[PDB]
Amino acid sequence: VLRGSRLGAVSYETDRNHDLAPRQVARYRTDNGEEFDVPFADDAEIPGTWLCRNGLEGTLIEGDVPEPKKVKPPRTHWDMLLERRSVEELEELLKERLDLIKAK
Amino acid sequence: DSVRAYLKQIGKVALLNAEEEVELAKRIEAGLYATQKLAELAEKGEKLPVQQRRDMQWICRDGDRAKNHLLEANLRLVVSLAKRYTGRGMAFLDLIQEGNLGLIRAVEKFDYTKGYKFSTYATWWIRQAITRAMADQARTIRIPVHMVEVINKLGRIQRELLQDLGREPTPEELAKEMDITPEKVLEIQQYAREPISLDQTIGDEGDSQLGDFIEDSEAVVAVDAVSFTLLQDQLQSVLETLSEREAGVVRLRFGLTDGQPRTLDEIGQVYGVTRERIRQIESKTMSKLRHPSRSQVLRDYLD
Amino acid sequence: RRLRTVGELIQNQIRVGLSRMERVVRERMTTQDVEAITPQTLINIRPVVAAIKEFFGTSQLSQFMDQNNPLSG
DNA sequence: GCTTGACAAAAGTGTTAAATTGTGCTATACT
């Protein structure tokens, strides 16, 4: 009565292994020690890091050091406290609190 | 409902008085400073005396415990706000839990020097956290936040205009208030529509569900599937009727041999002749094939 | 055993719609200017119209007329 | 049967103007 379709379409072509795309396999290792293989085309430009099956961004074995992939550092609770308190004020706070514990 | 366990467990800690909040915040700040001192001074040695070391570690632990206590006593606030936004699409207890994540941020930013209550500041953070949570997670097909806000604005305007006019407005009437074209609001309304459940029963009984009777448009039609292959043979038989000299150019031009079309120049990589000559050969073969002597063989495959 | 005629069947849905309208009106009369409100400005007729539309559309009793022949109808 | 000169249409290459998306923060008080 009503019709719809999947997110894709079908192709009727027939050919089989008689056509070969030149490919080579890269090797990756993850944090936990698992290893994985990924077939790439001979155009290569293989990436230094790959997201493997287990979900760990593993690194290639051929290179001694992969692409740095450097990223900015995180923002933490002290680093945001320092945006509202001066170190001079924190020194006085520490002195004031040390006075009470020193009382006993 | 089984949210009662959370309500009970948070009910074992009493509310803070106005003077305890400042004490807790100041303790948290002092403990943070003590931890940062112990972290920093290690980079250059600078041994502290054992008594001072133990006192400073106690300060650190007291600050951490005061932060935990401040979160504990204020967990009760989040539920009073979460109960307002329940029913919009996300679960009540999920609302509470992710508003708690704005509550930790509120505790992180709250300070006493402003001379204001903890609730006054924490309410804003809890509310924005709940709003963001609902915006991101309330729909099966995710809608970015700004799109959710414009959809909400359209809904708000449409409700009032319907209350006034007494009927659903035409798109231009809503456009006159949105300051955007009528087709724009018509597209927003399309973006707003939710998917239906594929498992809903159909037929007024439990005989079957809706999904059991959806006809697939992109099906593998049998007669076509075979038919194409026949053409892929018949065409070959026509191309095989030519000399290999002529056939190779067409087979390379349209990529029949390997599936990749080739420019006029690239065909010369094996044939040697110039691109213009390859074009002339292509024209000769192309005119020979279209002659009725070979057209009728495969004309009616086009449909 | 009694017989709900068409009138009572329609009346039940009218009552439901007016009950929803009553809930809305009693909720909203607490939050409007007193002595300046007007009855036509707070009576909301949407729920009753929605109930009437739902009854004639989806109710199991409101069936398609059987026009096979005069006797069938 | 084919090369060469010369030309225009189509399409890659890169910049960037515009559109879209993600994110932190709003301090009367409210538990």
Side-chain angles (χ1 to χ4, degrees):
Chain A
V1 65
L2 78 165
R3 71 169 79 73
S5 65
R6 301 176 198 293
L7 211 55
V10 65
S11 183
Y12 292 114
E13 64 203 304
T14 76
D15 189 358
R16 296 294 86 193
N17 290 350
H18 292 347
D19 294 356
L20 295 96
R23 76 172 70 76
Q24 66 179 0
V25 64
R27 170 62 146 264
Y28 290 111
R29 66 170 61 269
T30 54
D31 298 352
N32 64 353
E34 271 164 80
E35 283 145 1
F36 300 96
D37 291 331
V38 177
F40 292 129
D42 276 3
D43 291 331
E45 202 170 280
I46 71 187
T49 176
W50 193 254
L51 183 55
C52 295
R53 301 197 305 96
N54 58 4
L56 275 296
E57 291 179 309
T59 61
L60 189 77
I61 64 160
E62 283 282 87
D64 57 345
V65 179
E67 52 191 292
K69 219 70 155 183
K70 62 92 175 179
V71 177
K72 75 177 189 291
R75 186 167 172 246
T76 68
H77 184 52
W78 190 39
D79 166 90
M80 65 180 288
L81 170 70
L82 198 66
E83 298 195 78
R84 75 186 150 161
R85 299 298 193 198
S86 174
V87 296
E88 293 179 353
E89 296 170 292
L90 292 189
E91 191 286 320
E92 189 48 287
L93 170 55
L94 176 156
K95 181 67 181 295
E96 269 168 339
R97 291 293 186 186
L98 267 293
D99 293 342
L100 283 182
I101 188 60
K102 282 294 308 304
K104 64 90 176 179
Chain B
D1 306 359
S2 199
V3 298
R4 304 161 51 171
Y6 184 64
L7 271 53
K8 152 172 54 185
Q9 204 201 50
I10 67 179
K12 303 309 200 251
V13 62
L15 300 163
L16 301 177
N17 45 47
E19 292 188 297
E20 269 294 350
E21 322 194 300
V22 59
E23 174 65 9
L24 294 174
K26 185 142 162 297
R27 289 161 67 193
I28 296 159
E29 293 179 353
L32 293 161
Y33 187 32
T35 61
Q36 188 57 23
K37 276 280 181 171
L38 281 83
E40 287 189 306
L41 293 169
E43 299 191 350
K44 194 53 70 201
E46 303 294 356
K47 171 178 286 189
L48 274 188
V50 294
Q51 189 86 310
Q52 186 171 355
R53 189 72 169 207
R54 282 188 276 90
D55 286 352
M56 211 65 38
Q57 285 190 329
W58 183 90
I59 291 290
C60 296
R61 191 271 292 295
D62 187 55
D64 188 22
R65 181 262 303 284
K67 196 187 72 174
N68 286 11
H69 188 77
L70 182 60
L71 281 53
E72 298 212 356
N74 285 284
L75 294 180
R76 300 170 71 151
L77 179 60
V78 177
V79 286
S80 77
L81 289 164
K83 291 174 71 175
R84 301 292 296 278
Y85 297 114
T86 298
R88 304 301 189 170
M90 192 154 59
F92 178 30
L93 179 75
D94 272 295
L95 288 180
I96 292 163
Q97 190 68 8
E98 182 156 332
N100 293 343
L101 279 163
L103 178 141
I104 296 89
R105 175 47 50 90
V107 176
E108 284 184 330
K109 288 187 79 80
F110 172 77
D111 78 326
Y112 53 70
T113 307
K114 304 298 188 286
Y116 298 124
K117 296 288 289 298
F118 178 82
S119 181
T120 298
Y121 185 32
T123 301
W124 285 89
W125 271 108
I126 293 157
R127 196 191 306 285
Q128 64 84 30
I130 287 173
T131 300
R132 294 287 205 243
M134 188 196 292
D136 288 348
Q137 299 170 24
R139 289 174 176 267
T140 309
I141 302 180
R142 190 176 71 93
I143 300 187
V145 187
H146 70 88
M147 186 66 204
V148 181
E149 310 207 90
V150 299
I151 292 162
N152 285 338
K153 186 193 296 291
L154 261 183
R156 188 78 69 99
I157 291 164
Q158 180 183 3
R159 287 158 192 174
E160 278 284 350
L161 194 157
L162 191 153
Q163 172 59 9
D164 178 23
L165 181 83
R167 68 175 190 274
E168 290 285 0
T170 179
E172 80 205 89
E173 283 266 328
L174 281 183
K176 288 161 203 175
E177 285 168 351
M178 291 295 292
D179 291 332
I180 58 186
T181 67
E183 59 194 313
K184 199 67 162 69
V185 299
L186 188 58
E187 182 196 330
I188 301 299
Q189 287 175 240
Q190 190 53 239
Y191 283 162
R193 276 146 63 84
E194 299 169 7
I196 78 177
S197 178
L198 183 66
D199 291 87
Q200 76 187 21
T201 54
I202 192 67
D204 302 319
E205 292 191 4
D207 189 21
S208 70
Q209 51 263 70
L210 171 143
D212 289 354
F213 271 88
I214 296 177
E215 170 182 307
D216 55 352
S217 181
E218 311 315 348
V220 187
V221 181
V223 66
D224 290 341
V226 65
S227 184
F228 178 77
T229 66
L230 299 178
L231 175 62
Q232 186 171 288
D233 186 12
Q234 184 79 330
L235 183 149
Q236 212 66 69
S237 83
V238 171
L239 265 60
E240 195 160 312
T241 300
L242 301 167
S243 68
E244 178 58 24
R245 191 267 193 284
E246 293 160 300
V249 172
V250 175
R251 206 187 299 120
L252 294 174
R253 178 63 161 140
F254 292 99
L256 281 60
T257 192
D258 60 13
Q260 285 202 273
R262 274 151 150 61
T263 182
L264 307 162
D265 176 64
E266 188 175 342
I267 297 169
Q269 284 214 0
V270 69
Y271 264 100
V273 295
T274 191
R275 59 186 158 117
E276 181 55 30
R277 183 63 191 154
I278 298 194
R279 184 211 151 201
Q280 292 169 12
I281 298 194
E282 182 178 1
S283 302
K284 181 68 181 294
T285 310
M286 202 66 227
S287 58
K288 297 287 99 174
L289 277 72
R290 71 179 66 193
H291 190 273
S293 62
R294 307 200 202 293
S295 169
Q296 190 80 324
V297 177
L298 57 86
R299 169 163 190 175
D300 63 79
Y301 282 91
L302 72 173
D303 61 26
Chain C
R1 296 174 78 186
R2 66 188 292 270
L3 198 73
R4 294 167 162 182
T5 55
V6 57
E8 193 153 290
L9 297 163
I10 295 163
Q11 192 208 59
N12 288 352
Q13 304 314 76
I14 292 175
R15 183 186 293 109
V16 167
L18 291 185
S19 173
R20 314 271 160 61
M21 183 278 288
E22 190 277 331
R23 184 221 311 261
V24 173
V25 165
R26 204 151 42 100
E27 178 261 318
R28 175 173 62 190
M29 71 185 328
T30 197
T31 294
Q32 283 211 357
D33 50 354
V34 184
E35 202 176 288
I37 200 167
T38 309
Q40 43 194 350
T41 60
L42 73 165
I43 295 163
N44 175 3
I45 67 179
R46 196 186 71 243
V48 58
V49 176
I52 287 291
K53 187 54 52 62
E54 193 77 341
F55 171 64
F56 280 109
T58 315
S59 185
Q60 185 165 12
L61 304 169
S62 177
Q63 295 158 11
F64 261 72
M65 171 88 167
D66 203 48
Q67 302 169 245
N68 215 315
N69 63 43
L71 181 65
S72 174

